């Protein structure tokens, strides 16, 4: 049991990261227009999947 | 493909976002962010980690 | 001398001795160029203290160099990192030989 | 949940993404396969 | 030359995995959705379930851990700029059931 | 129970590999000729490198 012995852990700073594919503006705008149509929505499963 | 993939006007590859609010409690702390994706971009979430 | 000759056999053992490299065209440009990278003027491969924000993989390697090498070797990095498959990474790769300490 | 039934809504059964997409999008997904993957963003239900 | 009368014991070890049972008519993996799940009698009425386990005894309290395999999916929709909506469907045992 | 006060040291080792860099616009290997090459530099220009 590590609570008793005297372990400790302190957090100081935290920042968030992201990356972008510098896609050419015309193609990106085509994608943006195409992907808002209500018949191109997103599906997604969850491996384990179960209760 | 010679053209129509990469842009030509200055745009960054990696972006770093600061928290705008941090709150602390003896057993958990809550951090908020205001992520911003501008127009003419697509961000795939697979490349975001703390 | 008679030991192994890297310039011929392929055994390279001094890579970790590089601090940075800068490229420039026609006395006033910058080929990475165009606010592309975090440190846009040149590539940074390792840092002293203050660069403790920009290191990745629990070592002293700046993020952007890790990104560049991952991409240029296996076209991976715009979709989050992971372990490239066995076929696509041969013996003289970049990810067979990475070691943090 | 009213215009189309439950199962066939979330692509539990029915037709794969090769059909129910605005064929422009299929064209695109086949245009940039090698350097920007998309196929992992749509179910393709199977049934025995 | 000087053996003794002996008996023999046998056992096994199968750590690091789950015991499975498929809900198929003949225990095969013929599709992501099994056939019996589509059988009419199971999709047009209700039924109660009763399971019984007999296990090896042990002297410190333990837990029986059961995973009911089901379907879990989410559909995501982004009609306008800066608006995101979702629908979560998990079935059976849908949100709102024990 | 009575350990000394410590500081930390980190480094890396990647012998037996070549430090490379591609001449493309987005660092990917989309083919063996490269956008920024087929630009051919409009197959007409010139430069010196530092």
UniProtKB/TrEMBL annotation, chain B:
Cellular localisation: Host nucleus; Virion
Induction: Expressed in the late phase of the viral replicative cycle.
Superkingdom as given in the UniProt entry: Viruses
Family: Belongs to the adenoviridae hexon protein family.
Quaternary structure annotation from Swiss-Prot or TrEMBL: Homotrimer. Interacts with the capsid vertex protein; this interaction binds the peripentonal hexons to the neighboring penton base. Interacts with the hexon-linking protein; this interaction tethers the hexons surrounding the penton to those situated in the central plate of the facet. Interacts with the hexon-interlacing protein; this interaction lashes the hexons together. Interacts with host dyneins DYNC1LI1 and DYNC1I2; this interaction might be involved in intracellular microtubule-dependent transport of incoming viral capsid.
Biological function: Major capsid protein that self-associates to form 240 hexon trimers, each in the shape of a hexagon, building most of the pseudo T=25 capsid. Assembled into trimeric units with the help of the chaperone shutoff protein. Transported by pre-protein VI to the nucleus where it associates with other structural proteins to form an empty capsid. Might be involved, through its interaction with host dyneins, in the intracellular microtubule-dependent transport of incoming viral capsid to the nucleus.
Note: All late proteins expressed from the major late promoter are produced by alternative splicing and alternative polyadenylation of the same gene giving rise to non-overlapping ORFs. A leader sequence is present in the N-terminus of all these mRNAs and is recognized by the viral shutoff protein to provide expression although conventional translation via ribosome scanning from the cap has been shut off in the host cell.
Protein's recorded name: Hexon protein
Species for this entry: Human adenovirus 57
Automatic annotation (TrEMBL), chain C:
Sites marked Involved in interaction with pre-protein VI: 77
Domain of life, per lineage: Viruses
Regulation: induction: Expressed in the late phase of the viral replicative cycle.
Localization per Swiss-Prot or TrEMBL: Host nucleus; Virion
Its biological purpose: Major capsid protein that self-associates to form 240 hexon trimers, each in the shape of a hexagon, building most of the pseudo T=25 capsid. Assembled into trimeric units with the help of the chaperone shutoff protein. Transported by pre-protein VI to the nucleus where it associates with other structural proteins to form an empty capsid. Might be involved, through its interaction with host dyneins, in the intracellular microtubule-dependent transport of incoming viral capsid to the nucleus.
Note: All late proteins expressed from the major late promoter are produced by alternative splicing and alternative polyadenylation of the same gene giving rise to non-overlapping ORFs. A leader sequence is present in the N-terminus of all these mRNAs and is recognized by the viral shutoff protein to provide expression although conventional translation via ribosome scanning from the cap has been shut off in the host cell.
Family listed: Belongs to the adenoviridae hexon protein family.
Subunit structure: Homotrimer. Interacts with the capsid vertex protein; this interaction binds the peripentonal hexons to the neighboring penton base. Interacts with the hexon-linking protein; this interaction tethers the hexons surrounding the penton to those situated in the central plate of the facet. Interacts with the hexon-interlacing protein; this interaction lashes the hexons together. Interacts with host dyneins DYNC1LI1 and DYNC1I2; this interaction might be involved in intracellular microtubule-dependent transport of incoming viral capsid.
Name this protein carries in UniProt: Hexon protein
Species, as recorded: Human adenovirus 57
Gene transcribed to yield this protein: L3
Residues included from the entire protein: 708 to 808 of 959
């Amino acid at each position: 049991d590590l609570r008793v012995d005297g372990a400790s852990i302190k957090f100081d700073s935290i920042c968030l990261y992201a990356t972008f594919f510098p896609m050419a503006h015309n193609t990106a705008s085509t994608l943006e227009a195409m992907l808002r149509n209500d018949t191109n929505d997103q599906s997604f499963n969850d491996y384990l999947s179960a209760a | 493909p010679t053209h129509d993939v990469t842009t030509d006007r200055s745009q960054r590859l990696t972006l770093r976002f600061i928290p705008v609010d941090r709150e602390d409690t003896a057993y958990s702390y809550k951090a908020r962010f205001t992520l911003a994706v501008g127009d003419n971009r697509v961000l795939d979430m697979a490349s975001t980690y703390f | 001398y008679s030991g192994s000759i890297p310039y011929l056999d392929g055994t390279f053992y001094l890579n970790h001795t590089f601090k940075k490299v800068a490229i420039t065209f026609d006395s006033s440009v910058s080929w990475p160029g165009n606010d592309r990278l975090l440190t846009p003027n040149e590539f940074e491969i390792k840092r002293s203290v203050d660069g403790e924000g920009y290191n990745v993989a629990q070592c002293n390697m700046t993020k952007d160099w890790f990104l560049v090498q991952m991409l240029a070797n296996y076209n991976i990095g715009y979709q989050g990192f992971y372990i490239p498959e066995s076929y696509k990474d041969r013996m003289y790769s970049f990810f067979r030989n990475f070691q943090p300490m | 949940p009213s215009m189309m039934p439950q199962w066939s809504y979330m692509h539990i059964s029915g037709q794969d993404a090769s059909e129910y997409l605005s064929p422009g999008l299929v064209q695109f997904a086949r245009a940039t396969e090698t350097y920007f993957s998309l196929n992992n963003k749509f179910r393709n239900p199977t049934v025995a | 030359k000087t053996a003794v009368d002996s008996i023999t014991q046998k056992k096994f070890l199968c750590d690091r995995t789950l015991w499975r049972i498929p809900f198929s008519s003949n225990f095969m993996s013929m599709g992501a959705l099994t056939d019996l799940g589509q059988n009419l009698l199971y999709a047009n009425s209700a039924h109660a379930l009763d399971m019984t386990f007999e296990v090896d005894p042990m002297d410190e309290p333990t837990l029986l851990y059961v995973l009911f395999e089901v379907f879990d999916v989410v559909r995501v929709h982004q009609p306008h700029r800066g608006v995101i909506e979702t629908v979560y469907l998990r079935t059976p045992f849908s949100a709102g059931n024990a």
